[PDB]
Amino acid sequence: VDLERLQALAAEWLQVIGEDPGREGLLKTPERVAKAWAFLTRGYRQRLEEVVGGAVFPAEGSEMVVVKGVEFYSMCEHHLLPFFGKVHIGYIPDGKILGLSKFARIVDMFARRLQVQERLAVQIAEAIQEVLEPQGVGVVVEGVHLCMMMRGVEKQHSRTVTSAMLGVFRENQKTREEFLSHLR
Amino acid sequence: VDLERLQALAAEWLQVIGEDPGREGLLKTPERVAKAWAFLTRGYRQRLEEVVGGAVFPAEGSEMVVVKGVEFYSMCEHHLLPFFGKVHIGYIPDGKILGLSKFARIVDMFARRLQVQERLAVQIAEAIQEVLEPQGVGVVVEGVHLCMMMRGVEKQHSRTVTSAMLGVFRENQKTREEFLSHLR
Amino acid sequence: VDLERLQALAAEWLQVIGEDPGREGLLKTPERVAKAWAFLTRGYRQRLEEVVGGAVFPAEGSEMVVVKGVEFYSMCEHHLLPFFGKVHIGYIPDGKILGLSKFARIVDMFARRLQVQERLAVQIAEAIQEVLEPQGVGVVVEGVHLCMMMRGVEKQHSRTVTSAMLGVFRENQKTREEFLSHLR
Amino acid sequence: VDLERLQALAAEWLQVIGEDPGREGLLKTPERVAKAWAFLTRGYRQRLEEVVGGAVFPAEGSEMVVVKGVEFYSMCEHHLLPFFGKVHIGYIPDGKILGLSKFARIVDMFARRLQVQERLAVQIAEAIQEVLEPQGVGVVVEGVHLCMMMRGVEKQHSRTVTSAMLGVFRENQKTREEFLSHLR
Amino acid sequence: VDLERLQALAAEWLQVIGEDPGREGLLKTPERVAKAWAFLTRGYRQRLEEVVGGAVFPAEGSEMVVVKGVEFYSMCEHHLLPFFGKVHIGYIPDGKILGLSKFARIVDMFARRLQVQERLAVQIAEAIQEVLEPQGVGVVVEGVHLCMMMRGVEKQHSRTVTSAMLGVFRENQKTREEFLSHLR
Amino acid sequence: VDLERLQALAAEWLQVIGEDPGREGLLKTPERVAKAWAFLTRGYRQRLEEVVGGAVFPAEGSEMVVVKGVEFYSMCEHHLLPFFGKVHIGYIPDGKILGLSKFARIVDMFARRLQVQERLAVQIAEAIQEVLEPQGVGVVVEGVHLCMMMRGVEKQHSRTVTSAMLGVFRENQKTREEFLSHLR
Amino acid sequence: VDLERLQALAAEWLQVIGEDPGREGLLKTPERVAKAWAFLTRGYRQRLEEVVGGAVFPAEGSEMVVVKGVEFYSMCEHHLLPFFGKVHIGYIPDGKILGLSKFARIVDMFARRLQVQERLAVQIAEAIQEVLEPQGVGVVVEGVHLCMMMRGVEKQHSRTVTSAMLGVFRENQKTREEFLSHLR
Amino acid sequence: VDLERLQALAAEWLQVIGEDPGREGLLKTPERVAKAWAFLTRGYRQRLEEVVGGAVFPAEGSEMVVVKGVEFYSMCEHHLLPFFGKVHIGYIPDGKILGLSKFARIVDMFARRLQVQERLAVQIAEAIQEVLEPQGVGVVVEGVHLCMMMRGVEKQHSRTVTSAMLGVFRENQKTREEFLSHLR
Amino acid sequence: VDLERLQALAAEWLQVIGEDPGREGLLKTPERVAKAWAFLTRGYRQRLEEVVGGAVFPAEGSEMVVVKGVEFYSMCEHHLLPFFGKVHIGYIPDGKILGLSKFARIVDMFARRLQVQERLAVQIAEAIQEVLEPQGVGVVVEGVHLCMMMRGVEKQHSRTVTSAMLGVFRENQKTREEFLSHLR
Amino acid sequence: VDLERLQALAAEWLQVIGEDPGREGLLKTPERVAKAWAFLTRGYRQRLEEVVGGAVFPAEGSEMVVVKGVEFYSMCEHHLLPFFGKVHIGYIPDGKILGLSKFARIVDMFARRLQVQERLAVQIAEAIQEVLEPQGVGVVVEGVHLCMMMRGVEKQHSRTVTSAMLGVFRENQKTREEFLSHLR
Ligand SMILES: Nc1nc2c([nH]c(=O)n2[C@@H]2O[C@H](COP(=O)(O)OP(=O)(O)OP(=O)(O)O)[C@@H](O)[C@H]2O)c(=O)[nH]1
Ligand SMILES: Nc1nc2c([nH]c(=O)n2[C@@H]2O[C@H](COP(=O)(O)OP(=O)(O)OP(=O)(O)O)[C@@H](O)[C@H]2O)c(=O)[nH]1
Ligand SMILES: Nc1nc2c([nH]c(=O)n2[C@@H]2O[C@H](COP(=O)(O)OP(=O)(O)OP(=O)(O)O)[C@@H](O)[C@H]2O)c(=O)[nH]1
Ligand SMILES: Nc1nc2c([nH]c(=O)n2[C@@H]2O[C@H](COP(=O)(O)OP(=O)(O)OP(=O)(O)O)[C@@H](O)[C@H]2O)c(=O)[nH]1
Ligand SMILES: Nc1nc2c([nH]c(=O)n2[C@@H]2O[C@H](COP(=O)(O)OP(=O)(O)OP(=O)(O)O)[C@@H](O)[C@H]2O)c(=O)[nH]1
Ligand SMILES: Nc1nc2c([nH]c(=O)n2[C@@H]2O[C@H](COP(=O)(O)OP(=O)(O)OP(=O)(O)O)[C@@H](O)[C@H]2O)c(=O)[nH]1
Ligand SMILES: [Zn+2]
Ligand SMILES: [Zn+2]
Ligand SMILES: [Zn+2]
Ligand SMILES: [Zn+2]
Ligand SMILES: [Zn+2]
Ligand SMILES: [Zn+2]
Ligand SMILES: [Zn+2]
Ligand SMILES: [Zn+2]
Ligand SMILES: [Zn+2]
Ligand SMILES: [Zn+2]
């Protein structure tokens, strides 16, 4: 990512909207924004293999594992405005379990991109499926979207839930149900 | 609508109920009431096609999407008093997903009319079924009614829930149950 | 109701328990008590037909309608002490829906009598059944009883739940479960 | 109040906003609206003396009495839209105390009119002052305004607090503070 | 208390309100009602010295003791309907402290009578003052009144707070303030 | 604001960060972002006189008026990332009161700019002071900043409170205290 | 119960633990302790028929009756330390319903003994079964155990749930489930 | 403590209340009870010097240190029944601070005895004073008493607050207020 | 455990991280750390048979027993950082029930080791199975992991749920569901 | 720091406590522990000047700025066990305001060391006083300590509050009080 190009773009952005790029508090803005967006889009430049590291251990049992409340922050591809909340993950191992924090690293890998919540849940679930090959994976993403809060419809109480169910989580309704019950 | 006729009716309404349209605080009231009512009934003059704004994107998955807590305000056709609360929407796509904000715009289109809560839920669900042609749609409307609170029976703790299920949400019981669970 | 007789009975009631009907704070008590009981037992003198006063409209859909949290106050026939709480009503129409507030008026008609909570739920459900002839009706009553709280066992944390299920609410387990779930 | 004239105005209102007065659901609306508004403005036709009903008793002590959480409903004189919430009353008697329910009756007398929240608090406080001539009285009104929620700015989380302090509540900082502390 | 006369009065009461004194469920009601009222007015027949049972001990220190949340139930002398809630007591000893449970026994002594909340607070405070002769005592009574909820104004959200401050609690602003702060 | 120039800038922004501006979901992004920023910076192009309209009425009393919970959304001038929360306003009128919703319009006027929370509170307070010239104004802004949540320090539980006190709110500590107490 | 022997045993107990049986504060302790234990074990000396007092009435309907939140206090037979919480009771009548307060009297009968929570649940259920011979009865006991909190493992956050299901509650999965759902 | 004697006393206690020391569930009870009481009265046998075990460090500053929510369990000397809750401690050092956990060890030293809540607060405060000789100490104890809950008055919502203020906490009203505020 | 060797390792640890072992505050740290770790790993040195202490009793019934909220503390074997939360246990006896506190003792035996949450749940369930040979047992562990909060991903809102189901808890869907429902 | 030496010490630590460094799950533990501790003590190697990053801007007003809820994690120098919670910062500028995020960076700089909570508060406050030279600064640290929860006294409900007041926050009592009020 060319930071110099972003700085120039952000500098021109400031004047077009009616601001003074030469103003005290805005002098370092173009630079700050460039770095911000480099970090906010770093997910595209990450590799699932490096993200997971070697944190794949032998299964201690065959029971469901649920990692809930993994906060996430993303940017809607439609308005380039933040949407955020939490990701809840559930899975039944076949023979391998993942290091808990790796779930969070996977979430960040896909969240730090321009997204749509429906895709985020699917990519997270697919990544986990690919790394562990468990009996099944379930991913629930719940977030608030600033694009419909600070503009447009300006709704305030709304929240969106998207999900992705693979393997036994898609097959056995009782399994999916038990996973969703743990979230309430 | 004819604002001049509304203003004249409102000015007379003030007189009949025992008020003084000449009062300082009531001088601009007939005008404010006319504009307010034009806004509160604007839903009758909206077109579903324009409300959607072509914000129909290709489905990212087959899993249920739930847009909950969309606050709404409406007027009961029986007393012309407000009833409000929230609208919860759940659906399973069939190659098409809607822009999140459009759900809120569809809600406002039907809420900004004289209504009955049972109808509001059906119309919202049918509008979503027409725009997107998903496997199913589920709409739950929960509201409090001022015509039951500030007059008549004067009940204070009551709340009404109405709904509409289409496609798999009406067919598949486990699907409906899963949608409802997400609301608790 | 003979307000004059209730007034004389109340005056003597004051004397027998060791009070003085002649003291300033009790002067108007026999009259106040008389009027209070006339109101508290008014349910016996009401007619369902008049309570509903029409307000029966054609159904807008086939989905369940849930009117929850209708507060109620009644008197136990055993001790003549208040028991109160909330009444939750659910029904699937068969071509006819009821005006929301009429549910409250029906609740009051039966609550404003000497009661047994188990009976109250059944009578409310049966009244709804007669008026709408819906596919099914479900009524849940939840209340605290002063005869259990301010005397006798003097338990403080207890509350009682009673209900009545008719039509499809009795026959269809899933319909009943869906109704009860909307209450949690 | 001329109910016949209100019904006529309401019927024309339905036509002007774009609705059909002939609709089955709107046939009885003009009558319902007329009756509703007569009730919603009955406060103008009430008399403080009749509202109190001589329920003024000898003081039992010289300590503060606080009647909190008296729910109220009113109509803003600016838009004729409902604003509602609760009224909290505090006072220190000077030989005379008021029947608790009379505070509620006084609240309703001034609430069932076209109002501005600032005035509602003042009139309630002055009414109490006139009736009891206490050492002091304080009134706090907290309400949500639909004209700010259903339209205009459409803000959702806002609430307004207005108050009126008389006698010792205005003159004694500690007294007022003690009263406000009771409300938290 | 003449239970026989109460039973006769209650049996006639059932007749006057329109009920059937002979039906199975009301056969034992006059008897249950008589006993209930004997219990509810037992406070008139109790004496402070027997209630305290000599449970007065030497002060362990000089700081205030606060006994809060003592639930109480009483009957308003105006309507003979229950009012209930909690009593909070605070006092600074003057060489003597009271057995904690005796505060509850004192509350019941004055609550189990026909009362006015303002008086209940004062009497509890004076009973404590007499038994311990402390540097000061403060009593706060908070309750809901059924005569305001199940009839009349029918307000649902209101609660009334009354109090009585003696000695240092009345004269020392900071002492009273510290006491009230413990209740929040 | 030149929307065409923003569209071109946003288009180049998309490719520099590593995205495909020709991708289905990003085709209309440059346009959507342009409109978004025009709206998000519209505050600079508003006039306080037009915002307030003519909503200045005579004072109903001299007591404090508190408008709390006015939600707001803004953009930090440092990172061009959203920060949001609520604004609480309190004032003691000298002779004029403001229309409640105008407080919200003033908040939006200054919030829809590139800001720093410290300045936002001051500008809001100054605007109100200028329009009403009351005895004093108090403004409290509380918000969460995405720039320290979704990046940088990545703190999650943090909230920032900034304020501005003018007139009696700056002078009398007791007044400022009473205002802040209403907020808790 | 031989109170004299209890007093002697308690006086010796005070001596053995190292206290002074002669000090002012312990002089009446043996007496207080003896009386307390007579009360705490009074359940052994009670009989189901007298506890019920013939308060058995004809069934008003066929739906389940749930009496929840009946607080109870008992003593574990293992350490003679208190365990307490709440008992929830549910049953489907077979022509007979029980006076609500009798459920509480039955709970106390079995609680005021040396117990094991598992047994307490079973005995309450069996007592109800015997008195009403209902289609089924379910009892859930939830409590905290001081022998686990103030000594031994000293865990602070634990609570134990025990239950007993008879008739249809044991055999009908959905009936048991509906009962447990009412408790949540 | 003579465990053997307590064991013999406990065995006879079981017999006199109507139980059977020989039944399976009571076989090891006399032994369990003996050991429990040895632990519950261990506070008498501890020494402050050893409880603190050094752990006194030089002060890092002059500001108040508040250790709140230290759970405690004790036994009333009046009924030998548990009373428990929390102890909150506050102090301003004078060159010396205490190891956080030592506050808990001191609490237990005094709680594990036969007590009076008023005394417990004073003894804890005095122990802190002797160990640190701070500028001031403040101890607040809040607890529920089983002798008031499971017998006697049987009140359920009550809790008692007792305290001890030494040095600047007694002398400086603002310091005391600041301490108490940190507790809310 | 060689405490002397641990102290030596801890002293060198202080030097290597950059601290001064000679500091007044760190002089006793090696000793404190040594003792702490001996306690934190005491679970390896415990025996299930001694932990249970023969506290196995004859079953009082055949219904489920649920011991919930047993707080636990452990150390992740991966980073040697604490992870903690609560353990919930459910089981249906087959003639034998366990002393409630023994569940807590079993939890601690396995928690006070280096662990992975998935294993902790399994070992607890197997331990119970071995001791009681019940119809089934279910264990749910919910914990927060400092290695995910203090470092690494630094996620703040996340919590992990692991479980183990044996016998009827694994084989009977309804049984497991009933157990999980009790936890909500 | 020397990671190789930390790894060697950690590998030996595993052996001494009774573990097997050869275990699959412990193979990479010494390495993970070394890196973790390097990160957890990185605060010793940070420079305040670099932490601020020159993010000191001109003051927008003279009103108090409060940055609350900054979560923090630290290690106690006494047991090398984590203690964590939140840090609340309040200050009144003197021509200079700090970038919000820098407060969080200052917190981490001092938290990521071996600490005592009393010191942490002072160092944070002194760092802010040096960077910005405001009229005053106030810092409140609230945390839970694992060395008190997972070992030793094993108290579960305790929390410790420490603070540091500089300038007007130490001088002006009303200023300190206002800052503390904002935290409640
Ligand atoms: N099902 C349904 N009923 C409604 C809605 N809004 C609304 O006012 N109603 C009901 O319409 C009915 C009209 O009753 P009515 O013709 O006797 O008029 P009324 O004003 O005397 O009724 P009320 O005093 O009981 O409120 C009321 O029972 C009212 O509750 C709604 O959205 N759905
Ligand atoms: N201050 C005070 N007033 C009380 C108490 N209990 C109680 O009923 N009152 C009041 O006594 C008054 C009696 O009024 P009233 O003689 O006009 O009788 P009413 O039944 O027509 O009054 P209502 O319908 O407004 O309740 C009521 O305002 C009632 O609220 C109490 O504890 N304290
Ligand atoms: N102080 C006060 N103002 C009120 C009350 N009710 C009420 O509508 N107002 C205000 O009256 C003003 C009328 O403003 P306006 O004459 O420009 O009419 P408008 O409909 O365009 O206002 P809006 O769109 O901002 O709500 C609004 O700002 C409204 O918030 C009330 O109780 N107290
Ligand atoms: N199932 C069940 N167990 C109980 C109840 N009350 C009660 O004390 N217990 C258990 O009875 C057991 C007696 O154990 P034990 O004979 O080894 O005595 P102890 O005092 O040394 O046990 P502890 O220190 O673990 O509490 C404890 O595990 C205790 O938790 C109860 O109501 N139900
Ligand atoms: N399944 C499971 N994983 C655990 C537990 N405790 C624990 O640290 N882990 C995981 O063990 C893994 C070790 O990963 P790693 O060898 O790459 O080391 P790391 O320190 O770089 O990991 P990190 O920075 O992502 O936390 C982490 O992903 C961590 O979340 C536990 O109880 N269960
Ligand atoms: N004031 C203060 N004391 C602390 C902090 N962290 C910390 O461990 N301490 C205390 O340092 C003291 C060290 O006590 P000690 O030398 O007798 O060691 P110990 O492990 O046997 O103590 P313990 O078992 O009571 O926890 C403990 O009382 C502990 O609570 C802190 O941040 N501030
Ligand atoms: Zn968007
Ligand atoms: Zn209506
Ligand atoms: Zn009864
Ligand atoms: Zn308005
Ligand atoms: Zn009354
Ligand atoms: Zn920023
Ligand atoms: Zn026990
Ligand atoms: Zn006692
Ligand atoms: Zn770890
Ligand atoms: Zn420590």
PDB file of C-alpha atoms in Angstrom, chain J residues 127-173:
ATOM      1  CA  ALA J 127       3.020  11.276  33.693  1.00  0.00           C
ATOM      2  CA  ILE J 128      -0.046  13.280  32.614  1.00  0.00           C
ATOM      3  CA  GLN J 129       1.054  16.242  34.758  1.00  0.00           C
ATOM      4  CA  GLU J 130       4.453  16.238  33.007  1.00  0.00           C
ATOM      5  CA  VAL J 131       3.180  15.857  29.409  1.00  0.00           C
ATOM      6  CA  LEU J 132       0.421  18.430  29.750  1.00  0.00           C
ATOM      7  CA  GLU J 133       0.789  21.032  32.466  1.00  0.00           C
ATOM      8  CA  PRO J 134      -2.926  21.374  33.370  1.00  0.00           C
ATOM      9  CA  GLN J 135      -4.548  23.047  36.364  1.00  0.00           C
ATOM     10  CA  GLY J 136      -5.001  19.571  37.798  1.00  0.00           C
ATOM     11  CA  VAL J 137      -5.257  15.836  37.136  1.00  0.00           C
ATOM     12  CA  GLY J 138      -7.199  13.036  38.793  1.00  0.00           C
ATOM     13  CA  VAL J 139      -6.628   9.304  38.296  1.00  0.00           C
ATOM     14  CA  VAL J 140      -8.751   6.479  39.675  1.00  0.00           C
ATOM     15  CA  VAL J 141      -7.687   2.856  39.288  1.00  0.00           C
ATOM     16  CA  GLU J 142     -10.169   0.095  40.052  1.00  0.00           C
ATOM     17  CA  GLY J 143      -9.020  -3.482  39.859  1.00  0.00           C
ATOM     18  CA  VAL J 144      -9.448  -7.061  40.860  1.00  0.00           C
ATOM     19  CA  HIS J 145      -6.419  -9.016  42.084  1.00  0.00           C
ATOM     20  CA  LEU J 146      -5.891 -12.666  41.185  1.00  0.00           C
ATOM     21  CA  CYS J 147      -3.447 -13.138  44.061  1.00  0.00           C
ATOM     22  CA  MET J 148      -6.439 -12.541  46.372  1.00  0.00           C
ATOM     23  CA  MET J 149      -8.880 -14.611  44.297  1.00  0.00           C
ATOM     24  CA  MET J 150      -7.143 -17.747  42.990  1.00  0.00           C
ATOM     25  CA  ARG J 151      -5.002 -18.329  46.097  1.00  0.00           C
ATOM     26  CA  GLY J 152      -4.386 -17.091  49.647  1.00  0.00           C
ATOM     27  CA  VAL J 153      -7.579 -15.598  51.113  1.00  0.00           C
ATOM     28  CA  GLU J 154      -9.534 -16.625  47.998  1.00  0.00           C
ATOM     29  CA  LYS J 155     -12.025 -13.739  48.262  1.00  0.00           C
ATOM     30  CA  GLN J 156     -14.288 -13.488  45.205  1.00  0.00           C
ATOM     31  CA  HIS J 157     -16.293 -10.261  45.502  1.00  0.00           C
ATOM     32  CA  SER J 158     -13.475  -7.869  46.376  1.00  0.00           C
ATOM     33  CA  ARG J 159     -12.270  -4.957  44.246  1.00  0.00           C
ATOM     34  CA  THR J 160      -9.653  -2.291  45.067  1.00  0.00           C
ATOM     35  CA  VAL J 161      -9.760   1.405  44.267  1.00  0.00           C
ATOM     36  CA  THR J 162      -6.659   3.588  44.434  1.00  0.00           C
ATOM     37  CA  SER J 163      -6.236   7.156  43.209  1.00  0.00           C
ATOM     38  CA  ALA J 164      -3.961  10.164  42.744  1.00  0.00           C
ATOM     39  CA  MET J 165      -5.010  13.826  42.729  1.00  0.00           C
ATOM     40  CA  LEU J 166      -2.778  16.651  41.469  1.00  0.00           C
ATOM     41  CA  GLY J 167      -3.242  20.404  41.172  1.00  0.00           C
ATOM     42  CA  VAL J 168      -6.836  21.613  41.479  1.00  0.00           C
ATOM     43  CA  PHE J 169      -8.046  18.008  41.855  1.00  0.00           C
ATOM     44  CA  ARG J 170      -6.151  17.888  45.152  1.00  0.00           C
ATOM     45  CA  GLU J 171      -6.820  21.544  46.045  1.00  0.00           C
ATOM     46  CA  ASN J 172     -10.435  22.158  44.988  1.00  0.00           C
ATOM     47  CA  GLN J 173     -12.692  19.658  46.790  1.00  0.00           C
TER      48      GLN J 173
END
